[PDB]
Design an enzyme around this catalytic site. Structure first.
Site, PDB file in Angstrom:
ATOM      1  CD1 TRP A   1       0.741   3.381   5.752  1.00 58.80           C
ATOM      2  CD2 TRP A   1      -0.819   4.070   6.839  1.00 58.80           C
ATOM      3  NE1 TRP A   1       0.439   2.427   6.837  1.00 58.80           N
ATOM      4  CE2 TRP A   1      -0.804   3.026   7.292  1.00 58.80           C
ATOM      5  CE3 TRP A   1      -1.947   4.781   7.229  1.00 58.80           C
ATOM      6  CZ2 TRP A   1      -1.623   2.315   8.497  1.00 58.80           C
ATOM      7  CZ3 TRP A   1      -2.823   4.613   8.178  1.00 58.80           C
ATOM      8  CH2 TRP A   1      -2.563   3.111   8.867  1.00 58.80           C
TER       9      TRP A   1
ATOM     10  NE  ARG B   1      -7.458  -7.554   2.275  1.00 61.58           N
ATOM     11  CZ  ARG B   1      -7.854  -8.654   1.829  1.00 61.58           C
ATOM     12  NH1 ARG B   1      -9.037  -9.103   2.197  1.00 61.58           N
ATOM     13  NH2 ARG B   1      -6.955  -9.632   1.491  1.00 61.58           N
TER      14      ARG B   1
ATOM     15  CD  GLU C   1       2.248   0.669  -2.193  1.00 57.35           C
ATOM     16  OE1 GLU C   1       1.054   0.790  -3.009  1.00 57.35           O
ATOM     17  OE2 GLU C   1       2.205   0.671  -0.850  1.00 57.35           O
TER      18      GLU C   1
END
Ligand code: HEM
Ligand code: HEM
Ligand SMILES: Cc1cc(N)nc(CCc2cccc([C@H](N)Cc3cc(C)cc(N)n3)c2)c1
Ligand SMILES: Cc1cc(N)nc(CCc2cccc([C@H](N)Cc3cc(C)cc(N)n3)c2)c1
Ligand SMILES: C[C@H](O)[C@H](O)[C@H]1CNc2nc(N)[nH]c(=O)c2N1
Ligand SMILES: C[C@H](O)[C@H](O)[C@H]1CNc2nc(N)[nH]c(=O)c2N1
Ligand SMILES: [Zn+2]
Lengths: 411, 407
Positions: B278, B109, B283
């Site tokens: 992105w 963020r 992940e």
């Protein structure tokens, strides 16, 4: 009411009812979750309900709820509280209580072991020298030459809060840390403040990287006294690596016995402010946290230098790579010396089986995910994928403030 | 009521006041913490509108101005008359950026204010949705130099006319149960794959088949579209040291793009609002590749590395994990597709947290999600206390449409 938890890897769903027995509060509200916050004299009035609740639990566990022995014991505790304002636990209740505090410890991944706990009753202890003797026997018993056994030693309970038994050490065995004039730290940075207290109380510091700290012991509210644990009782493991022969030359070692000495044990409203307990290590506690935290031994750089990893960008994952090698080394060393240790794969797999068992036989298992998930390789352990409910059951272990902040000095 | 968060590595203590403006509930109570559970009218609408417009006009330093009062007035008028209202473009952009700013599970963020918003409120059909989505995909991908973006389809009306993207992400691989008993492709997408075949898709039946989009407009039955193959940027996975790695035949897509969530702004609900940034390396390399219930490749890699797989305590799993993650980062970097590693991402978030404490009085954060799935305690977020609470505007999870849809 019922609450469900799902495992996202297996789709197994469990149903919790045990949370209905939880009384103590969590720190969370409907508007705020404090699940990652590290820290989120009783009256007769508040004491008897607590005693009653505990004895009801104890008597149910032995299949004697409502019996004459149950009722007589309630009446007897009631009268004892009425006239002396506290009460004494029977040995059997003490043992049950200490086992259950472990069973209820929601941050503990090792709880499959909870019912095997050797309980040492040190309630007849009266002096710091007496406490020293008890703690030595505990270390020797628990250590068992490498075949570690869980144990707890329980000193006299709180009375007026002015006569507390306290172990000032945070763990029974820990290495000194020394802040240098240049701002660097020699030894363990986590123990600097306590190390300074010991020095001030008269300990002669050897000033090396792995000096076992003396015990500082307070009996009956008196000023604490210094004692050195017999070195022959302190089992240590030199750390080496199975393939990397330069690993030994980093000079690393660690002690075998993890033993918490700063927590408060609550049983039926009684408060045991000195209750050191021990188990055996999960490898990551040493190899991830003690060795690799930036605020601890911080060895990542030196390890990755020797592995000649590319250190110019974090994206080579040099820290991660060096981290795994260190943890292999810790497990290999302990194993080679026959000192009990468990890896994070084995421990988390055992914990899931334990948790599932508890849900069947007990109706739940309070677990703190933040603490249960290991500090490396989180998601390739089964606990990462396990939903958990955290709530507070008694008997319990509680954090208490360090005694040097609160102690009234006699001088 | 004024709460402190401490970093245990650095001793920095921040004071959170922003939590008091928290609106929605957490799932937790004073008796039970649910921090690790994955999923814990005109009358209702005007308070929500007012709350939002108040914060909007406050943000542009025009709180209590005539234009502030004038808009509150206009929206009030509009709700009483029409039972809903329309956001100004400026309000829509602000709301979208703030939903991301308020996403307590998002480590990325620091980027929140650089979000390109594509206003697709004029869309009426599923073909239009498709056009909008390709343009989003091409804009965000930007030949590997990724840019954050969201596309916002029309808002909920009476709830019988919802726009939905049925896909959970814009770009995902198909999953097929085999006669063999095992699973071909991504096991996480079997059900959705079946619905596609059911709806007419001719599956190639391969390990890495990009799923088609299933788009629903105006509460109609959803339709199928294939994203132009040339707009789906993919990366072959190789390792910089293990020449055999490429032989595993692994690839992943460059664009992470969530398409199943509901954007709530000023009480209005945007049920189709696909958004993208992105990847953080873990992940793909930790979760996509190594979850037991995913591509689950640890065993195959460890074998090729000739590790002692006899005992867990050799840490063969951990070793193979680091390597797979090195390969993901290296491949993305080699082909120049934006990626961030977990060290750099979490360091950025700690800086973002300090900016938000200093400039907003806090930052809601979910520690369980923010801490990376590998190497937790060697990233700074592990040692950072975080308070989790819900602010609006927000992104909210919503049920899979196939459960709700009547055909
Ligand atoms: C027998 C082997 C055991 C293993 C492998 C084990 C594992 C662990 C680990 C890894 C932690 C987290 C430690 C940290 O991150 O600093 C922990 C916490 C804890 N365990 Fe154990 N445990 C064991 C035995 C025990 C025993 C015997 C007790 C007490 C009877 C106990 C009660 C606790 C408590 C109260 C905590 C929370 C500590 C805190 O908040 O500082 N455990 N356990
Ligand atoms: C720019 C790069 C970005 C990075 C590196 C990033 C990082 C992440 C990561 C790692 C997660 C966890 C996802 C998972 O574990 O499955 C996440 C969750 C999330 N992020 Fe981001 N983010 C980015 C951009 C965005 C943008 C542009 C938005 C919205 C405009 C957004 C909103 C979210 C939300 C709502 C979640 C939680 C998703 C869920 O519950 O499934 N993020 N973020
Ligand atoms: C019996 C046992 C078995 C085992 N495998 N490991 C252990 C190690 C436990 C331990 C050791 C050092 C520091 C902490 C914890 N860091 C001590 C701590 C600090 C603060 C501020 C709060 C809090 N709740 N706790 C906890 C014990
Ligand atoms: C914009 C963006 C950037 C980035 N780097 N990564 C992403 C990953 C998004 C994503 C992908 C797959 C699965 C999930 C989530 N795991 C999907 C999910 C499932 C359930 C049951 C609940 C819930 N809240 N979420 C979320 C997005
Ligand atoms: C802020 C955060 O809660 C803190 O770093 C916690 C996280 N998880 C942990 N987990 C364990 N087992 N031990 C710890 O000391 C911590 N520390
Ligand atoms: C049960 C638990 O909440 C679940 O496994 C979570 C843990 N943390 C996570 N963290 C992120 N970033 N993404 C996830 O999908 C999850 N899954
Ligand atoms: Zn909570």
């Amino acid at each position: 009411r019922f609450l469900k938890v799902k495992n996202w890897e297996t789709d197994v769903v469990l149903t919790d009812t045990l949370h209905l027995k939880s009384t103590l509060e969590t720190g969370c509200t409907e508007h705020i979750c404090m699940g990652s916050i590290m820290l989120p004299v009783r009256t007769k009035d508040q004491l008897f309900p607590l005693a009653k609740e505990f004895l009801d639990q104890y008597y149910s566990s032995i299949k004697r709820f409502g019996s004459k022995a149950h009722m007589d014991r309630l009446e007897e505790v009631n009268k004892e509280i009425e006239s002396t304002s506290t009460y004494q636990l029977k040995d059997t209740e003490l043992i049950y209580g200490a086992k259950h505090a472990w069973r209820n410890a929601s941050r503990c991944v090792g709880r499959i072991q909870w019912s095997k706990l050797q309980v040492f009753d040190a309630r007849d202890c009266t002096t710091a020298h007496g406490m020293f003797n008890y703690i030595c026997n505990h270390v020797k018993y628990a250590t068992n030459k490498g075949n570690l056994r869980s144990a707890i030693t329980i000193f006299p309970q709180r009375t007026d809060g002015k006569h507390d038994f306290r172990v000032w050490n945070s763990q029974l065995i820990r290495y000194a840390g020394y802040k240098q004039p240049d701002g660097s730290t020699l030894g363990d940075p986590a123990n600097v403040q306590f190390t300074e207290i010991c020095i001030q109380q008269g300990w002669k510091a050897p000033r090396g990287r792995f000096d076992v700290l003396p015990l500082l012991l307070q009996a009956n509210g008196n000023d604490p006294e210094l004692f050195q644990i017999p070195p022959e009782l302190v089992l240590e493991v030199p750390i080496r690596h199975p393939k990397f022969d330069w690993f030994k030359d980093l000079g690393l070692k660690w002690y075998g016995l993890p033993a918490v000495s700063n927590m408060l044990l609550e049983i039926g409203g009684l408060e045991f402010s000195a209750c050191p307990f021990s188990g055996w290590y999960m490898g990551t506690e040493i190899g991830v946290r003690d060795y690799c935290d930036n605020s601890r031994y911080n060895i990542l750089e030196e390890v990755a230098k020797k592995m000649d990893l590319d250190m110019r960008k974090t994206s080579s994952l040099w820290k991660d790579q060096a981290l795994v090698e260190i943890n292999i080394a810790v497990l290999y060393s302990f194993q080679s010396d026959k000192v009990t240790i468990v890896d994070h794969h084995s421990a988390t797999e055992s914990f899931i089986k334990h948790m599932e068992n508890e849900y069947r036989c007990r109706g739940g298992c309070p677990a703190d995910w933040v603490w249960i998930v290991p500090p490396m390789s989180g998601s390739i352990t089964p606990v990462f994928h396990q939903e958990m409910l955290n709530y507070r059951l008694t008997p319990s272990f509680e954090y208490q403030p360090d005694p040097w902040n609160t102690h009234v000095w006699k001088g």
